Amino acid sequence: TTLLNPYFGEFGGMYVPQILMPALNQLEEAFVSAQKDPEFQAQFADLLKNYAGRPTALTKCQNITAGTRTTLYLKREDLLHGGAHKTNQVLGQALLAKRMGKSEIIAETGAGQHGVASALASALLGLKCRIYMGAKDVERQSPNVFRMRLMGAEVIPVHSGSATLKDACNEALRDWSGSYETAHYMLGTAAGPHPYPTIVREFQRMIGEETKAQILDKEGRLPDAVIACVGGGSNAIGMFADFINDTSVGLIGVEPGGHGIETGEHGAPLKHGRVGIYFGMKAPMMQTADGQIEESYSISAGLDFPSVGPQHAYLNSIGRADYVSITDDEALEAFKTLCRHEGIIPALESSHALAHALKMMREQPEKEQLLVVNLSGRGDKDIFTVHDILKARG
Amino acid sequence: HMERYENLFAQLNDRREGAFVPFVTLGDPGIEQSLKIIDTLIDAGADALELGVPFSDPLADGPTIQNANLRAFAAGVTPAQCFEMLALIREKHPTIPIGLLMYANLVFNNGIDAFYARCEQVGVDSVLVADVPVEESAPFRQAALRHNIAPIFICPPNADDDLLRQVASYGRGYTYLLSRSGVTGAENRGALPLHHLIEKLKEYHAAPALQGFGISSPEQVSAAVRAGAAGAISGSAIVKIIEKNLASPKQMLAELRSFVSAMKAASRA
Ligand SMILES: Cc1ncc(COP(=O)(O)O)c(CN[C@@H](CO)C(=O)O)c1O
Numbered sequence A: 001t002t003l004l005n006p007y008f009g010e011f012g013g014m015y016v017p018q019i020l021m022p023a024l025n026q027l028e029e030a031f032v033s034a035q036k037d038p039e040f041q042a043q044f045a046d047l048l049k050n051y052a053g054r055p056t057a058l059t060k061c062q063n064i065t066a067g068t069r070t071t072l073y074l075k076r077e078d079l080l081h082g083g084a085h086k087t088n089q090v091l092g093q094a095l096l097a098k099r100m101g102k103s104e105i106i107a108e109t110g111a112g113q114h115g116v117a118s119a120l121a122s123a124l125l126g127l128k129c130r131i132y133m134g135a136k137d138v139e140r141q142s143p144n145v146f147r148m149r150l151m152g153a154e155v156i157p158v159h160s161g162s163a164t165l166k167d168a169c170n171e172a173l174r175d176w177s178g179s180y181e182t183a184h185y186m187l188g189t190a191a192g193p194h195p196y197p198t199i200v201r202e203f204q205r206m207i208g209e210e211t212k213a214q215i216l217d218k219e220g221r222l223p224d225a226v227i228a229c230v231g232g233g234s235n236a237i238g239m240f241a242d243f244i245n246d247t248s249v250g251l252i253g254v255e256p257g258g259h260g261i262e263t264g265e266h267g268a269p270l271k272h273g274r275v276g277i278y279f280g281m282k283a284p285m286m287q288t289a290d291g292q293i294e295e296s297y298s299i300s301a302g303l304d305f306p307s308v309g310p311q312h313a314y315l316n317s318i319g320r321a322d323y324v325s326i327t328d329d330e331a332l333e334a335f336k337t338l339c340r341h342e343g344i345i346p347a348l349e350s351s352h353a354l355a356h357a358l359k360m361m362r363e364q365p366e367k368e369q370l371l372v373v374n375l376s377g378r379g380d381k382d383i384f385t386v387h388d389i390l391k392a393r394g
Numbered sequence B: 001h002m003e004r005y006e007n008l009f010a011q012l013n014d015r016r017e018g019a020f021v022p023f024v025t026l027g028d029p030g031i032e033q034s035l036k037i038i039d040t041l042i043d044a045g046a047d048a049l050e051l052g053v054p055f056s057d058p059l060a061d062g063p064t065i066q067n068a069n070l071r072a073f074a075a076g077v078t079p080a081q082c083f084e085m086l087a088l089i090r091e092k093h094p095t096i097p098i099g100l101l102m103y104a105n106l107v108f109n110n111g112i113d114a115f116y117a118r119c120e121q122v123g124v125d126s127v128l129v130a131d132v133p134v135e136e137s138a139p140f141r142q143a144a145l146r147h148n149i150a151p152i153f154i155c156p157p158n159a160d161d162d163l164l165r166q167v168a169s170y171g172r173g174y175t176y177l178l179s180r181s182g183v184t185g186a187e188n189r190g191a192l193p194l195h196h197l198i199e200k201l202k203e204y205h206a207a208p209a210l211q212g213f214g215i216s217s218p219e220q221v222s223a224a225v226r227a228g229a230a231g232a233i234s235g236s237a238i239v240k241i242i243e244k245n246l247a248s249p250k251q252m253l254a255e256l257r258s259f260v261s262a263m264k265a266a267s268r269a
């Protein structure tokens, strides 16, 4: 038994080996306790403001919407220390580790963004951090690996399986099963086994809370829709959370379309996958007809999770939130468009959310609509990838 | 409902024997070579079998079994082919208990209830789902009981009382007693006086306890029986012999025979 419901409808659960259940039940009690602790909240709030840079800006985009009736605001999580929203929840998770007496930190990473945030959080709070990463990702994210190593972290390449993110996720839980008495597994998205989807949501929910306050201030009304890209669901549920009971506000999550849903080479399990059991949860998954878990594809290395957070799958099923996809070419174009017209270089991840907002604007240019896009990260890490693409053409 | 576990333990009791149960991955390093590896194991003295179905993300297995899945995956092995193998094995050995080591998604993939019906159709005796804890087991054990399959539950070394009474009441066939923490591997051995766990398992009328993980020496099979367990499971040790003798099929079976002969001999009165 748990203190909190591990399920969002039919989705979620705690599908881990029996040996890891005490580790999970310990993590849940620490969370419920820390959530009632004002001195935990004070410490959390202080690291967010004075170390991470919160509150982040809410930038209006007059240029990009000119000639239409759309008003577009960007939630500037790209200005957060570390360059992405990942920093928010690692600071809370690392405080949770110390509250439990834990000394070490386990982390998985694909794009390297979660690994960098885990490293910086560990350096700040005096925790020994080891990071697992697929060997194919390590070779492709040598900048982020070097940053992680610069910040004192051990980067362990995983050659198991397909040597990508799902295999690093496996190696972290393997590590955790024997080391949980001293180490804390700092899961990097709003997925995995309970209590992680609840914990990661509550540690990212300041994104939406600030957006609500900042939009009531600037516009005097709630947005018509908030739009966020969805890898595992961390940044999207962080934005959605404070709006779920404002039923007039649309919740739009964007999954990577890859080369196209028709081509099979995408990463949109919520809408174009099949429910399975993996990574300790019941959730939609990219899987073979046999039940083997395959890889996502996206131009965006951060949207490479083969599944999705269970609360998103739940919110989809009750019709509260909507989920679309955006192809690689659509994201690259939105990337280009924000660079030339607002002087902001977005992450290829967040470029998917922006690309759908541009589509809502362009397909119906006379529609009066107040849109907010969650800019989950800055795109300085992607200029090399964008360069090689348009060098291969024009 | 056959009672292949219930009977094996009664017979072993009357011979005051212990059970030795080897584990292998199905189709490692190939269907035909795997079929005659299992035949060598049963012939060398194995009392029961636990067989793994290759899965892409074996989050409970250490490197040795991880390699076994990839060797199997390089051979074209599928869950469908594995069930044709299980049917052949049962057609050759009617009395030996056959248990499956499953990961949840392979069971849930096209209906939990249909997976357990297939096991009964092929003669499988028990199923342990590695990533389904007792707290999430209800649809699995209910489907298993409806098809005369015994649901196997891991009793970890850190177990408290509520778990042990759950494992005792929900499980059938045998109880998987974990030797240590962590994942699979002959490398790490190191029991944790399971003596008391085995007693309250017996006090709670649980199914006979087999100790597994890290069992790689005959002295461990002897020690386990003396502690109160009904026998020992050894997986990576078997898998390591296969992995070492890949280019020597006839010597692979030869050492496989000599290992099982040793562990089984450590188990008798
Ligand atoms: C900038 C940015 N925006 C969005 C995402 C997607 O994560 P989310 O969908 O859980 O919010 C990521 C993922 N980055 C993860 C997944 O690989 C990592 O381990 O690095 C990201 O780096």
Ligand SMILES: O=P(O)(O)OC[C@H](O)CO
Binding pocket: B023, B050, B065, B101, B183, B184, B185, B186, B212, B213, B214, B215, B216, B233, B234, B235, B236, B237
């Ligand atoms: O490899 P072992 O001996 O540590 O035990 C794990 C088995 O392969 C599965 O029960």
Ligand SMILES: [Cl-]
Binding pocket: A053, A054, A055, A056, A057
């Ligand atoms: Cl600020």
Ligand SMILES: [Cl-]
Binding pocket: A065, A066, A067, A068, A069, A070, A071
């Ligand atoms: Cl406008």
Ligand SMILES: [Cs+]
Binding pocket: A230, A231, A232, A255, A256, A267, A268, A269, A296, A303, A304, A305, A306, A307, A308
């Ligand atoms: Cs995804």
